[PDB]
């Protein structure tokens, strides 16, 4: 997310036993980094 010129990243890594889909249970993501970079963002893309 972007707030007040900061770009924030949160994450989680978990083992799962399901190939098709997201697990129905609950788990909470924790902050990785909080970057002071100030850019406008309206689009994104993943790298493969």
């Amino acid at each position: 997310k972007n707030i007040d010129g900061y770009f924030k990243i949160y994450s989680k890594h978990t083992p799962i036993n399901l190939v098709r889909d997201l697990p129905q249970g609950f788990s909470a993501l924790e902050p990785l980094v909080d970057l002071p970079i100030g850019i406008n963002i309206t689009r994104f893309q993943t790298l493969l």
Partner: peptide, 24 residues
């Protein structure tokens, strides 16, 4: 601070045009 001793010449290299935006 004023900087007329450092940054004047004129010194037209100095340019001008959301919070903390760097719109180049």
């Amino acid at each position: 601070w004023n900087s007329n001793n450092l940054d004047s010449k004129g010194n037209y290299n100095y340019l001008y045009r959301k919070p903390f935006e760097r719109d180049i």
